[PDB]
Amino acid sequence: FMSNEYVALITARGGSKGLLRKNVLPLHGIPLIGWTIKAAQGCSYISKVFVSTDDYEIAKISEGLGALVINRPEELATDTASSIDVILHAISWLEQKEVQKYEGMILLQPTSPLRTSHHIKEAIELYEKTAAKFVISVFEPTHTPIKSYLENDDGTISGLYSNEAPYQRRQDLPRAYQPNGAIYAFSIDEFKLNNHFPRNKVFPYVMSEVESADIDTLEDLRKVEEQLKIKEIN
Amino acid sequence: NEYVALITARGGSKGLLRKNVLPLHGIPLIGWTIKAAQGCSYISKVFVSTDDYEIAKISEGLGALVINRPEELATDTASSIDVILHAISWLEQKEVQKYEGMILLQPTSPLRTSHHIKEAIELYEKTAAKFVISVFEPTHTPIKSYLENDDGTISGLYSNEPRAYQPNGAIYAFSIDEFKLNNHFPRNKVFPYVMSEVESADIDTLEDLRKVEEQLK
Ligand SMILES: Nc1ccn([C@@H]2O[C@H](COP(=O)(O)OP(=O)(O)O)[C@@H](O)[C@H]2O)c(=O)n1
Ligand SMILES: Nc1ccn([C@@H]2O[C@H](COP(=O)(O)OP(=O)(O)O)[C@@H](O)[C@H]2O)c(=O)n1
Ligand SMILES: [Ca+2]
């Protein structure tokens, strides 16, 4: 169908495998998660923004900004909790609590603050243009994996893709992509058919390595702060 | 075994302007590679293949010999094979000395030292290799990436999910005679010279150059 509706889902847990409270850390005057909430809200194609959280501060920040809160069960906020299970829970919550029927879900990670409304807009346009079942934001690494080698038992090496691939121009080879975790745009119906992410009609939404920045440490956060400060003062 | 170093440096670039001649810790970028080739005992002569006046002036000034590269071989479309074949042809006409191996070195790898070149040539001799290429093991293994299919879709490169190496572009040590009979890089008896990710730094932007400057102070 030509006319489709989209819902944004932001998954942010309180706990972490590190000694960092990532999702609420200040970045250029606002909590980290705020950059992703605002990117979703700023996009014309997004009807509603939902934040799935178990945390009081994340929920408070989210509601304050105008996003809707999906109260996530304890089991789904553990270090062992599966990405699929959180999505299925959010799909279930939406089907029971939200009257609007959505074709696609735009899953967005709070750890990708350089992914903007413009990136979401473009990813949804690609999703529609290609008749995709799943659009994932990716980047082309500086050292492309299509030009890599694998080690043989005798200690020699051979091209992973082909024998001539490591010596060929990157432009003359199929492109190899690395997902950056910023955007996962998928058909809600196709996700709950296999109860997992679609395996077919998967298209890449290409972003630069610079815009692919993922927050894991205070250094990652410091680097992005400087980048935003540099764009501010020029 | 006698070895000739070939440094391929074109004037043009898709990104960073005058890349090969930009200052890095007191020396033009290319000078780090010229000096790393000259500092290695196994290297008899150092040649710089360029289409550029500035690169040639810097190279001659550092004592390297200049191979004047034709315009078509300095384009964005120009093949790696064609640049090497041209240098092989130039060497066979303009050089009385016969070399068994060619050590192809990129000026964009300034953290690759004489020590790294010595070790790659030692591996080349010890293994009786047809080809030795400097590599690194990336933090994100290439086997876990996606490959773009013909219809525009993506799927896992290797499978839907082994030791992987990524060439860093710093050193290519191969037999000249063997390269001439194949008109391509050897496909067998290829051994990896493993370097760290940190020493595998490649200059493409002013940020890459600034990062190397900082880890050079
Ligand atoms: N079961 C989980 C795991 C991570 N996440 C969130 O997904 C983002 C990226 O996860 P991450 O790689 O930083 O992992 P942790 O910080 O949770 O150790 C973070 O913003 C998490 O808050 C979640 O919502 N539910
Ligand atoms: N057709 C070409 C392309 C690159 N090169 C050189 O190969 C090195 C690395 O090239 P590169 O991958 O960064 O691409 P460009 O700088 O040419 O855009 C540089 O020192 C280039 O000057 C060359 O000699 N002939
Ligand atoms: Ca873009």
Side-chain angles (χ1 to χ4, degrees), chain A residues 1 3-16 18 20 23-59 61-73 75-96 98-100 102-128 130-132 134-170 172-174 176-177 179-189 191-198 202-222 224-225 227-228 230 232-234, chain B residues 1-13 15-56 58-59 61-70 73-75 77-92 94-96 99 101-125 127-143 145-159 162-179 181-186 188 190-206 208-209 212-213 215-216:
Chain A
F1 308 99
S3 179
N4 282 6
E5 267 63 80
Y6 303 88
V7 59
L9 175 70
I10 300 161
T11 49
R13 69 188 289 222
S16 187
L20 232 74
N23 299 324
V24 302
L25 289 176
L27 177 68
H28 196 87
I30 65 168
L32 189 65
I33 192 164
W35 288 95
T36 294
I37 287 166
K38 295 179 160 308
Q41 288 170 323
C43 176
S44 58
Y45 297 111
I46 303 297
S47 303
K48 281 189 172 69
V49 182
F50 289 85
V51 175
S52 169
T53 192
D54 67 313
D55 186 78
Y56 174 95
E57 262 307 303
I58 296 163
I61 286 154
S62 303
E63 281 168 335
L65 289 179
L68 286 314
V69 171
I70 291 189
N71 299 110
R72 211 198 288 176
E75 323 92 60
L76 299 174
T78 70
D79 300 326
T80 57
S82 160
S83 181
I84 302 305
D85 297 329
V86 184
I87 298 160
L88 289 172
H89 173 264
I91 292 175
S92 180
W93 193 109
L94 288 173
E95 287 182 336
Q96 299 292 355
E98 180 55 52
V99 166
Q100 289 194 263
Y102 306 101
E103 191 285 324
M105 174 174 281
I106 316 312
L107 177 75
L108 305 156
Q109 283 179 23
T111 51
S112 288
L114 299 181
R115 168 262 302 102
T116 68
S117 295
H118 177 68
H119 293 128
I120 299 159
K121 181 187 161 72
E122 292 201 322
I124 291 165
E125 271 156 18
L126 177 76
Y127 179 87
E128 285 178 353
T130 59
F134 183 27
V135 160
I136 170 168
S137 62
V138 298
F139 72 97
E140 278 184 73
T142 40
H143 293 278
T144 180
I146 197 129
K147 289 176 77 156
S148 71
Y149 293 94
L150 296 172
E151 176 171 82
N152 307 311
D153 292 310
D154 66 355
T156 67
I157 48 158
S158 302
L160 186 165
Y161 187 67
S162 69
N163 300 298
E164 49 278 343
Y167 317 106
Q168 284 176 268
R169 278 181 67 230
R170 196 182 170 134
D172 308 326
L173 288 161
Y177 297 120
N180 64 16
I183 312 165
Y184 296 94
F186 55 90
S187 168
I188 291 165
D189 286 350
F191 188 99
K192 58 206 285 280
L193 205 150
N194 181 247
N195 251 28
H196 201 296
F197 283 104
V202 183
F203 287 86
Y205 172 62
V206 187
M207 287 172 71
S208 71
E209 203 159 336
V210 176
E211 304 163 330
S212 291
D214 190 65
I215 309 301
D216 276 311
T217 74
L218 280 178
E219 179 50 32
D220 293 345
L221 193 75
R222 192 205 62 78
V224 174
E225 267 279 359
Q227 282 189 68
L228 294 179
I230 287 157
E232 195 192 3
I233 313 147
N234 272 295
Chain B
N1 255 35
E2 287 329 313
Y3 303 95
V4 60
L6 176 69
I7 300 164
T8 60
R10 68 157 177 165
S13 189
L16 190 71
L17 177 57
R18 284 199 315 125
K19 194 197 270 200
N20 296 319
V21 303
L22 289 182
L24 172 69
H25 201 246
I27 305 154
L29 187 66
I30 193 160
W32 289 98
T33 295
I34 288 168
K35 294 170 91 59
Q38 289 169 330
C40 176
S41 60
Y42 299 107
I43 304 297
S44 304
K45 281 191 173 60
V46 181
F47 288 86
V48 175
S49 176
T50 190
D51 61 317
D52 189 78
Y53 165 69
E54 189 166 33
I55 297 163
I58 284 146
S59 302
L62 293 156
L65 285 316
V66 171
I67 296 171
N68 302 107
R69 210 199 292 172
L73 300 174
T75 71
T77 57
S79 159
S80 180
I81 300 310
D82 298 328
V83 166
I84 296 153
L85 289 172
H86 174 266
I88 292 175
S89 180
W90 174 286
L91 288 173
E92 288 181 339
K94 308 264 209 130
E95 264 293 319
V96 69
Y99 305 100
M102 177 171 279
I103 314 300
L104 172 67
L105 305 165
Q106 283 190 335
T108 50
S109 289
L111 297 185
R112 170 260 298 102
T113 72
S114 294
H115 179 69
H116 294 131
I117 301 163
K118 176 189 104 181
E119 293 202 321
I121 294 166
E122 270 155 20
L123 177 73
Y124 179 85
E125 284 181 357
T127 59
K130 278 175 169 176
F131 189 22
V132 163
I133 169 167
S134 62
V135 297
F136 71 100
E137 287 180 72
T139 46
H140 293 276
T141 188
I143 64 118
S145 66
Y146 292 93
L147 192 54
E148 172 173 81
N149 305 309
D150 294 307
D151 65 359
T153 67
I154 54 153
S155 62
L157 164 73
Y158 186 67
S159 69
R163 211 156 181 201
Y165 294 123
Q166 188 71 41
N168 61 19
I171 313 164
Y172 295 93
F174 59 95
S175 168
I176 294 164
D177 283 356
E178 182 84 21
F179 189 98
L181 57 82
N182 297 312
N183 288 314
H184 64 69
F185 283 104
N188 39 29
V190 184
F191 288 85
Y193 172 63
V194 186
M195 286 174 73
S196 70
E197 198 163 340
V198 61
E199 302 197 309
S200 290
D202 189 64
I203 309 299
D204 278 311
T205 73
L206 200 86
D208 295 345
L209 194 75
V212 173
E213 268 283 17
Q215 72 152 318
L216 235 40

